[PDB]
Amino acid sequence: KVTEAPPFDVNSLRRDIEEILSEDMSKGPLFVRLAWHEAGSWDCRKKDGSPNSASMRFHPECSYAGNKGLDKGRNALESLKKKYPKISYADLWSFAAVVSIEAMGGPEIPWRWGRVDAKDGSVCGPDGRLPDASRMQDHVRDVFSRLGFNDEETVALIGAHTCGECHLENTGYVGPWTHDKYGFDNSFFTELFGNEWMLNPNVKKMQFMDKTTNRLMMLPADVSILLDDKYRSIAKKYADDNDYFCNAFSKAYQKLLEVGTTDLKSLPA
Numbered sequence: 519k520v521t522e523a524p525p526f527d528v529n530s531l532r533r534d535i536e537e538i539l540s541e542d543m544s545k546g547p548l549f550v551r552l553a554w555h556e557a558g559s560w561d562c563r564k565k566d567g568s569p570n571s572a573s574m575r576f577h578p579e580c581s582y583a584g585n586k587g588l589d590k591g592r593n594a595l596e597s598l599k600k601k602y603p604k605i606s607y608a609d610l611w612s613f614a615a616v617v618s619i620e621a622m623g624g625p626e627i628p629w630r631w632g633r634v635d636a637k638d639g640s641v642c643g644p645d646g647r648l649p650d651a652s653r654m655q656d657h658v659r660d661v662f663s664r665l666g667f668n669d670e671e672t673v674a675l676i677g678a679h680t681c682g683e684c685h686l687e688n689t690g691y692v693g694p695w696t697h698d699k700y701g702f703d704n705s706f707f708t709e710l711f712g713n714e715w716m717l718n719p720n721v722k723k724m725q726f727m728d729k730t731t732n733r734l735m736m737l738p739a740d741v742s743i744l745l746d747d748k749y750r751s752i753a754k755k756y757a758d759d760n761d762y763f764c765n766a767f768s769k770a771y772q773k774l775l776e777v778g779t780t781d782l783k784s785l786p787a
């Protein structure tokens with residue numbers, strides 16, 4: 519459709535977002551959580567939640583349980599915003615996530631610019647939009663169905679737990695999903711199937727740890743892919759073919775960063 523050079527140097531910003539990661543690879547996954555959290559307020563029946571507008575900059579959305587710790591995300595981008603002031607926060611967040619999935623070795627995800635920032639909290643959809651980790655496949659399905667994803671998409675997207683880790687101080691959940699949390703591959707689904715999960719007695723919010731090492735963790739929501747026959751099957755394929763996986767995630771995540779958007783423009787070469 520519409521291709522246009524954007525009002526910022528996209529290859530200078532790419533290069534800087536990558537520079538941010540080299541000094542601190544812990545921002546990569548965090549950057550992927552923030553864009554997702556900025557997309558996941560959406561309702562495709564209700565056409566609301568203000569997804570992909572950096573509405574999370576405002577109250578009440580900034581204060582919701584599911585978005586705790588994401589200030590580190592926003593603050594870690596506030597200087598690239600000074601240095602590239604013709605970029606909306608919504609473009610900067612979605613672009614930093616896309617770059618961060620490339621850097622950690624995942625797929626190169628097609629990215630279009632044109633997102634327009636909420637200028638106050640009044641378009642801020644309600645809470646309970648973000649998924650509850652403490653819940654199971656029926657809640658998971660209820661959320662990603664309101665967001666507009668199929669079962670293939672939902673499981674692909676939750677694949678993102680392949681990178682990053684949970685923080686006591688953020689969600690009272692603790693530790694990484696894989697032994698390579700700065701890598702983005704299908705090893706979430708690897709580690710899911712190729713372990714025995716068991717209660718972690720040491721954490722007040724119910725989570726699972728791996729029998730082998732006790733170093734990996736899984737959320738009730740995560741382990742619900744194994745209990746849910748449908749999710750299980752797809753989870754199997756992704757565990758078995760990182761490419762079906764890496765292709766699945768690329769299209770799903772791009773769709774996530776463009777739910778509730780119009781007038782987006784392709785980058786030229």
Ligand code: HEM
Nearest residue numbers: 547548550551554649651675678682683684685688689739
């Ligand atoms: C039912 C669905 C999901 C639930 C319940 C869930 C829950 C969680 C929780 C509790 C954390 C830890 C937050 C923290 O303490 O720092 C987390 C981390 C993360 N999640 Fe999700 N999530 C889900 C789906 C997704 C999706 C769709 C993505 C990306 C598309 C994603 C990407 C991440 C990433 C990258 C992190 C790591 C954050 C960091 O390392 O700083 N999750 N998720």
Ligand code: NA
Nearest residue numbers: 559568569573
């Ligand atoms: Na939003």
Ligand code: NA
Nearest residue numbers: 698701702703
């Ligand atoms: Na990895």
